[PDB]
Amino acid sequence: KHNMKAFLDELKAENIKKFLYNFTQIPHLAGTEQNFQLAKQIQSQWKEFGLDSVELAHYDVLLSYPNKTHPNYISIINEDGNEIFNTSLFEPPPPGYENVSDIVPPFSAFSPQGMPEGDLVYVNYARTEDFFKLERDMKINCSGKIVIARYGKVFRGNKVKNAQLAGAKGVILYSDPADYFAPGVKSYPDGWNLPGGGVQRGNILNLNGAGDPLTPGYPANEYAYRRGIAEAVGLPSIPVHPIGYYDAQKLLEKMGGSAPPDSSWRGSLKVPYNVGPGFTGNFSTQKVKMHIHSTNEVTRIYNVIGTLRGAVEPDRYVILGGHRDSWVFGGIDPQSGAAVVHEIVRSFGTLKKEGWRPRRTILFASWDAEEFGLLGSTEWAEENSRLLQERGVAYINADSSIEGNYTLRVDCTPLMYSLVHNLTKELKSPDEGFEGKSLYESWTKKSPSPEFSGMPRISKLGSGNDFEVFFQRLGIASGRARYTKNWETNKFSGYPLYHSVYETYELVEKFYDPMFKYHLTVAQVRGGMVFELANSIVLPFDCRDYAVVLRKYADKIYSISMKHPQEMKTYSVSFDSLFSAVKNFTEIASKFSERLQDFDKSNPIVLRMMNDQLMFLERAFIDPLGLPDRPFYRHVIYAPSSHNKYAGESFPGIYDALFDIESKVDPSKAWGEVKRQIYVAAFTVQAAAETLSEVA
Amino acid sequence: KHNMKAFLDELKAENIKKFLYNFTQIPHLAGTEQNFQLAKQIQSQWKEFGLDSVELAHYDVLLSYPNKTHPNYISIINEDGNEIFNTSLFEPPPPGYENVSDIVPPFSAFSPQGMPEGDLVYVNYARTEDFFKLERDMKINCSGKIVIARYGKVFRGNKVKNAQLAGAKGVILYSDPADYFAPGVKSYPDGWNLPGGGVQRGNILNLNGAGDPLTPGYPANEYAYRRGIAEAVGLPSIPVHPIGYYDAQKLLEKMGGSAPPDSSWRGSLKVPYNVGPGFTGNFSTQKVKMHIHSTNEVTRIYNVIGTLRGAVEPDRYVILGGHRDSWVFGGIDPQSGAAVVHEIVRSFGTLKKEGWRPRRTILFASWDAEEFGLLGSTEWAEENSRLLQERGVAYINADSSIEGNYTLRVDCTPLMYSLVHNLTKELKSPDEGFEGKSLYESWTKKSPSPEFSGMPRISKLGSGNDFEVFFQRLGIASGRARYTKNWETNKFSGYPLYHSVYETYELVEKFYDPMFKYHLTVAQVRGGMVFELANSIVLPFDCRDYAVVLRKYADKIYSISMKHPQEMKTYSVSFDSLFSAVKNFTEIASKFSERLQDFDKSNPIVLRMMNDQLMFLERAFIDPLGLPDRPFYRHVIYAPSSHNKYAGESFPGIYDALFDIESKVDPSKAWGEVKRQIYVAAFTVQAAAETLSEVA
Ligand SMILES: *[C@@H]1O[C@H](CO)[C@@H](O[C@@H]2O[C@H](CO)[C@@H](O[C@@H]3O[C@H](CO[C@H]4O[C@H](CO)[C@@H](O)[C@H](O)[C@@H]4O)[C@@H](O)[C@H](O[C@H]4O[C@H](CO)[C@@H](O)[C@H](O)[C@@H]4O)[C@@H]3O)[C@H](O)[C@H]2NC(C)=O)[C@H](O)[C@H]1NC(C)=O
Ligand SMILES: *[C@@H]1O[C@H](CO)[C@@H](O[C@@H]2O[C@H](CO)[C@@H](O[C@@H]3O[C@H](CO[C@H]4O[C@H](CO)[C@@H](O)[C@H](O)[C@@H]4O)[C@@H](O)[C@H](O[C@H]4O[C@H](CO)[C@@H](O)[C@H](O)[C@@H]4O)[C@@H]3O)[C@H](O)[C@H]2NC(C)=O)[C@H](O)[C@H]1NC(C)=O
Ligand SMILES: CC(=O)N(CCCC[C@H](NC(=O)N[C@@H](CCC(=O)O)C(=O)O)C(=O)O)Cc1ccc(Br)cc1
Ligand SMILES: CC(=O)N(CCCC[C@H](NC(=O)N[C@@H](CCC(=O)O)C(=O)O)C(=O)O)Cc1ccc(Br)cc1
Ligand SMILES: *[C@@H]1O[C@H](CO)[C@@H](O[C@@H]2O[C@H](CO)[C@@H](O)[C@H](O)[C@H]2NC(C)=O)[C@H](O)[C@H]1NC(C)=O
Ligand SMILES: *[C@@H]1O[C@H](CO)[C@@H](O[C@@H]2O[C@H](CO)[C@@H](O)[C@H](O)[C@H]2NC(C)=O)[C@H](O)[C@H]1NC(C)=O
Ligand SMILES: *[C@@H]1O[C@H](CO)[C@@H](O[C@@H]2O[C@H](CO)[C@@H](O)[C@H](O)[C@H]2NC(C)=O)[C@H](O)[C@H]1NC(C)=O
Ligand SMILES: *[C@@H]1O[C@H](CO)[C@@H](O[C@@H]2O[C@H](CO)[C@@H](O)[C@H](O)[C@H]2NC(C)=O)[C@H](O)[C@H]1NC(C)=O
Ligand SMILES: *[C@@H]1O[C@H](CO)[C@@H](O[C@@H]2O[C@H](CO)[C@@H](O)[C@H](O)[C@H]2NC(C)=O)[C@H](O)[C@H]1NC(C)=O
Ligand SMILES: *[C@@H]1O[C@H](CO)[C@@H](O[C@@H]2O[C@H](CO)[C@@H](O)[C@H](O)[C@H]2NC(C)=O)[C@H](O)[C@H]1NC(C)=O
Ligand SMILES: *[C@@H]1O[C@H](CO)[C@@H](O[C@@H]2O[C@H](CO)[C@@H](O)[C@H](O)[C@H]2NC(C)=O)[C@H](O)[C@H]1NC(C)=O
Ligand SMILES: *[C@@H]1O[C@H](CO)[C@@H](O[C@@H]2O[C@H](CO)[C@@H](O)[C@H](O)[C@H]2NC(C)=O)[C@H](O)[C@H]1NC(C)=O
Ligand SMILES: *[C@@H]1O[C@H](CO)[C@@H](O[C@@H]2O[C@H](CO)[C@@H](O)[C@H](O)[C@H]2NC(C)=O)[C@H](O)[C@H]1NC(C)=O
Ligand SMILES: *[C@@H]1O[C@H](CO)[C@@H](O[C@@H]2O[C@H](CO)[C@@H](O)[C@H](O)[C@H]2NC(C)=O)[C@H](O)[C@H]1NC(C)=O
Ligand SMILES: *[C@@H]1O[C@H](CO)[C@@H](O)[C@H](O)[C@H]1NC(C)=O
Ligand SMILES: *[C@@H]1O[C@H](CO)[C@@H](O)[C@H](O)[C@H]1NC(C)=O
Ligand SMILES: [Ca+2]
Ligand SMILES: [Ca+2]
Ligand SMILES: [Cl-]
Ligand SMILES: [Cl-]
Ligand SMILES: [Zn+2]
Ligand SMILES: [Zn+2]
Ligand SMILES: [Zn+2]
Ligand SMILES: [Zn+2]
């Protein structure tokens, strides 16, 4: 039989390993020749693997690179202006790669150029609440200072935006071993920890879904009109640079001014973690000086787009997409995902050569420039938005397949909850001590949901990856899955060697997944989802699962507002409309589900009708006006957190209207906007429900 | 057979007459009890006529009414402050209606209150070019003046906006017999001309598609959050009032200052048409004083929504919609359209009772508050936008069925050109001297297209009626049809008794259409369109007709730019991308059409696929970002003219970027924005074409 089991059994751990090795011997930085070569290789192989068509789709987008003859670095500079200490110009290369060229040195992509000098302030994680503590409670003024912040907790773009709004004239990011050195584990190459010389690359934009900074709304094609740099979306206004913890120690050890306000401000280095500003008395006259000379340049990028045409509904698209560009070798990020996609394509291709075709069209993508702000996925979606809107069933992302070796992690729309439960019950656990048990059992045991015993944790989608355009802009049902570390010990730092030169094939093969079994399990989950989405007669979405979470989110946002009982009385703030819409959604979804079960299975229009209702249900949550000042976050139920792009926020319009509201100067106006967002949300929920009513 | 002929033959002229009579004995002003009663009657009858469901959909929207105890009027006031002349408080009621109550006196809906006093300036039609002439050429400054303008040529909202931007502190509108008294024809009741005491009501908003001024984007339902008046969309900032030409003569006869600049500024009254400012020397000290006390109030309105469920594609909607609210009796506007809709419903119902059902769902609508800014259609569409977007095949408007008795008028999307040609070839001409000829022959003969001999004129859609939300906001293929006057003698004033108390059943029965044959022909055209849209196996749209007009519009916009050859050189302004996209659209459409003819007719998915491609083709022309500063005009090919809401403009983004560009102070910036709009247009055309490519 050509069924799911046949697809699944064709997947091999050994193939994934071979592909990972192949994808990680040289760097594949976006906009470089090597990454164009790999794109061409992937195009050739997907064709050999059997896809109907495989094309490259290119765009000319704003990218950012250090100046090869004028290196970025930071100094302590004394009263004379001598540079008495200089941070590193490069990460020490790992064993066996010390003759690789074209390793981009660490840098913060899209930093402007500058050589600002000043006194340091230490801002912990540079979260919103860190700056509130500093300015409101401790009375420390960041204006005209250089801030130094530890990586972790939130997206670095948000740190930078926060620093900028507090009046910083520069930012220094560093990796603290409190957040990037796990107890008992050795540094690379002898373990999976971050060495003192290791540094995390990454962009520092605030794009809010825009894609290419120069072409928001439209694909960056050959005749595109570009904004000038000054009007570009999302660029930082102050220089920024990241460093490792050997260098950070040198910058922090002399800090004076106030003590840290409590122990959550102290990392693990042997320094006091004083907030500053400036250094202690004997060095009070020494300053910190940044030297940043990176340039932004419009550079060509390449996506690979593979098509496996549907036999019955070719005009319905199930998308498996993940990026190919890497900061350096991309041993985990992204090639552990890309190798998984490559084997998925290969298995689908195997079935196709034997005469099978999925019911619906499956599109496979190798995105470029994800690391520079989800640019390749976003431009392609801007180009193809009409097709996607009207034909897009689902998007399954495929970045890193592992960030740990403990259990499964799934983040997805509620419409895929049942599909994920059912699929994982039919998969074998790869976990030691669950031999012969299902993945569902091991995952449920190791990652219990906070809400329902006997069920696993499944998180909402946040952002910081290539599903953003599909989900929060276009309203296409999306999900992602990978192996991860223990939730209980999770410091929300990411894995230690993230975006460092030390992220290699060997890191994976020696320390994460030597048998490639976690990789195989992830290929089965991702591939399994795609198979069912593209092949099930009735789309495998359960609208009732949305009803359930909509109620939970409504309770949650209600409870936030209810911290302000007096204002809710004065301004007549009622959540009744939203709770009513959610009740209605629950009732209508319930009846739709009965019809979906009892409808006449012989009738294909009835079937296409009801599948259209399932497909356009995620779509119904889009507001074409967008969220306030964020036109590309159009989904009313889910946006990336305004304070942390990686985190998903529910009812974001109301959440942001309520955030810090006790500090607004015109409460009448602030509570009015809360009410406005309640109306918008209730209306959208009701409207989404009504798409599931009988159509006539 | 239950076919189109059966539908068509059931329509009766005598039924339309009876309905017109029934709909026009008392006023049906939006937000009044009488208009609620008629809505309930229409709901009851559509149910009796056989529709599956018939509901009222209500909204609470901003409306505008004069103060019943404090009348609006205008004065000439002398140096002492005595009011030496006062305009009328009411139009003399027509014979037999002099005891009707609740005739709203003439007023400009949404005028703010005020009693400004000042000197008059006469601004001809208050078009953009009239103010350019006045300010640029004649050097007359309207700041702090009261302007007086004749009705005609353009939408009155645009006149008011233009006056406001020239710094007027008030506006007076009047009907000139040059534009509202046809040669040789007597005044009402003895003919169809405007009497000296007649006055044209109408709103003066600049909504740009927003709907209810207080709730842009969202339906004005029970829990809606409303903007404050100061943030409301589209309200005028200066008082406005309309008058008849007896009163206008009194205001104009004393005007001094400059002479009119040429004869196109002179109407037909016995006055010099001096521009002013102010009166001639002996009366130089007399002033004009307006008294406006109307109030804006949130008022409930009611649409009637009838459903005739499709037998095969119930989830596909063909909409026949037209308004029910009238300024007074609504003898032409809108009840000549509504009576036509009523008989259409009745015929469809007749077929249904005999067991027939259309292939697709037909929705019938009786919209409210059209006269106050297309409010009822717009709110309903805002409420139902998700359904309409994904399921809306077509919208056929049904306001006034006649504005003349000479020939057919059709304005529609190019996608309906072939459908209209074919349908009219099968209809009988009602025209004297074409007995036994087809409607197509008479229409083609009396209204030849400017472009192709042997073909009739078909115009682009403008706005000022209830198709606006469907077409320019949502991208649903739309059209309208009615009998009209001779194009050759058309002064683009409208019919003389437009929006006056004199627009009655008798006006129609005595002077326009005594046998109700033009009405019947219009019911066949409108009903015929609906039938074919809702019943044809393959949607009756021809994408190739869009290709043809896209080329014509591209030539046109190119030619406007080419008036500025030097700037096009300096700024590298190229239209190549747009011409390329149009070429591509032509080629792809051509191949789609071949497939549509040759595809395998047995296959219903293939059929649903290709019909989806036809349905979503109009949709592809929508840009979700909207046009600049006009977020609800989202169609890239067609918007209402920025200078005249009634007129359609093609490539409006580029057109407006080019308008008056030689006057911009920063040409670099202005030409940049031209280029930006070219890119947007070319991209959108290409994207629309690609929806017609093979799907996979
Ligand atoms: C969740 O789903 C429920 C049940 O479907 C919806 O219930 C609707 O609730 C609204 C309130 O928001 C009701 O609105 C009321 O309608 C009355 C007239 O309704 C009749 O006529 C309509 C057509 O116009 C029919 O469709 C309907 O079935 C009835 O025949 C009005 O008279 C009411 O207005 C009066 O009272 C209000 C309330 O105090 C005053 O503000 C007004 O000034 C006025 O005096 C009112 O507008 C509506 O009828 C309900 N519909 C149905 C079918 O039951 C919820 O709205 C929905 N939740 C959300 C968030 O959408
Ligand atoms: C109307 O339809 C036509 C024909 O389909 C479209 O033609 C495309 O035209 C664009 C130009 O806008 C061409 O773009 C060029 O692509 C070259 C590479 O193309 C190859 O590889 C791609 C995948 O990446 C394949 O899909 C394609 O078939 C080819 O195999 C580039 O090398 C070109 O860039 C170089 O030259 C330009 C031009 O001087 C320089 O600016 C660059 O810096 C660079 O040096 C160029 O980008 C495209 O290939 C054409 N496609 C096809 C299939 O023919 C029109 O674009 C379309 N009109 C509109 C408005 O959409
Ligand atoms: C602090 C940290 O770094 N973490 C790890 C982030 C890993 C991001 C990675 N994505 C990825 O690197 N994308 C690029 C580009 C993203 C863009 O430009 O939007 C990037 O972030 O620089 C991925 O999705 O796998 C831990 C963390 C996870 C979730 C939460 Br809620 C809170 C904290
Ligand atoms: C000058 C004039 O009045 N004309 C007649 C207009 C008749 C408008 C009428 N619509 C209708 O009255 N609508 C209402 C509400 C519209 C709104 O608020 O948007 C209104 O205009 O006050 C209709 O569509 O039949 C002639 C004219 C026709 C076309 C062109 Br291009 C140029 C001139
Ligand atoms: C990764 O695998 C690819 C494909 O097997 C290798 O690329 C091939 O290189 C061989 C030897 O030079 C050529 O003859 C083939 O034409 C190549 N195929 C394609 C599709 O490009 C590539 O050499 C491998 N890379 C590494 C680092 O091992
Ligand atoms: C990278 O830095 C180098 C050298 O430090 C830059 O080269 C100089 O640039 C300017 C041109 O604008 C010249 O005035 C100098 O004479 C150049 N000096 C040398 C030694 O080459 C170079 O411009 C920078 N590269 C980028 C892409 O910005
Ligand atoms: C840090 O790096 C800087 C720049 O390379 C060093 O200062 C330079 O040293 C050379 C050689 O003495 C001088 O000619 C340059 O003029 C100096 N440049 C600047 C900007 O000061 C500095 O010596 C290094 N410091 C340490 C401790 O290694
Ligand atoms: C791969 O799995 C092993 C088994 O859990 C991990 O090793 C253990 O790590 C935990 C701390 O989380 C300790 O409690 C055990 O004592 C460790 N045993 C060892 C190292 O043999 C290992 O950390 C995992 N690898 C990765 C990269 O996460
Ligand atoms: C997940 O599996 C469950 C259990 O098989 C599916 O629910 C069943 O669906 C069948 C077929 O419609 C119904 O007749 C059974 O009553 C259902 N059982 C229960 C407990 O609901 C469910 O549909 C599957 N989910 C998805 C998305 O496929
Ligand atoms: C317009 O026609 C309607 C319907 O025929 C008339 O309304 C009917 O009035 C009669 C007599 O009062 C009642 O018995 C019916 O119940 C009414 N029907 C409905 C559906 O409302 C109405 O009287 C006519 N109006 C005019 C001005 O002639
Ligand atoms: C319409 O005009 C009347 C009378 O010219 C207004 O009535 C007056 O309004 C104010 C209340 O704000 C009172 O101070 C007066 O005493 C009222 N006078 C009389 C004679 O009634 C009325 O307010 C206006 N109506 C609307 C809807 O604005
Ligand atoms: C125009 O109308 C106004 C207002 O009704 C008239 O002036 C009023 O006349 C009465 C009676 O003489 C006075 O008590 C009011 O004080 C006047 N009001 C104002 C605002 O002036 C005026 O007489 C009328 N003019 C003509 C020519 O009919
Ligand atoms: C109804 O049709 C008649 C016939 O054309 C119109 O009457 C003619 O009007 C034209 C001017 O456009 C003259 O050339 C003829 O001399 C007129 N003959 C008449 C009045 O008998 C009449 O105007 C039409 N009615 C309406 C409302 O437009
Ligand atoms: C308008 O009628 C024309 C002529 O019948 C239709 O075009 C014909 O369509 C048939 C059926 O597809 C083709 O085989 C003929 O070749 C066509 N003739 C020509 C000259 O094109 C056309 O499809 C009708 N238009 C609509 C919208 O129905
Ligand atoms: C921070 O410092 C700068 C100038 O040195 C000043 O302009 C700004 O107001 C300060 N803000 C606060 C809150 O102290
Ligand atoms: C028009 O008149 C007013 C003041 O009476 C003045 O402020 C304005 O500048 C004038 N504009 C021109 C162009 O004359
Ligand atoms: Ca873009
Ligand atoms: Ca509204
Ligand atoms: Cl992922
Ligand atoms: Cl109409
Ligand atoms: Zn990645
Ligand atoms: Zn990454
Ligand atoms: Zn009308
Ligand atoms: Zn009207």
Side-chain angles (χ1 to χ4, degrees), chain A residues 367-378:
Chain A
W367 306 122
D368 208 346
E370 185 278 357
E371 295 297 5
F372 290 76
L374 320 184
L375 307 185
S377 61
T378 307

Side-chain angles (χ1 to χ4, degrees), chain B residues 81-111:
Chain B
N82 307 322
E83 292 181 350
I84 69 173
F85 162 71
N86 286 335
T87 59
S88 84
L89 303 183
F90 59 88
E91 287 178 289
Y97 295 87
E98 314 92 332
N99 193 51
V100 181
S101 50
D102 292 334
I103 289 162
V104 81
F107 78 119
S108 292
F110 303 100
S111 179

Side-chain angles (χ1 to χ4, degrees), chain B residues 397-400 465 480-482 526:
Chain B
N397 206 52
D399 203 358
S400 311
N465 224 288
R480 70 189 309 190
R482 58 167 59 145
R526 293 174 181 173

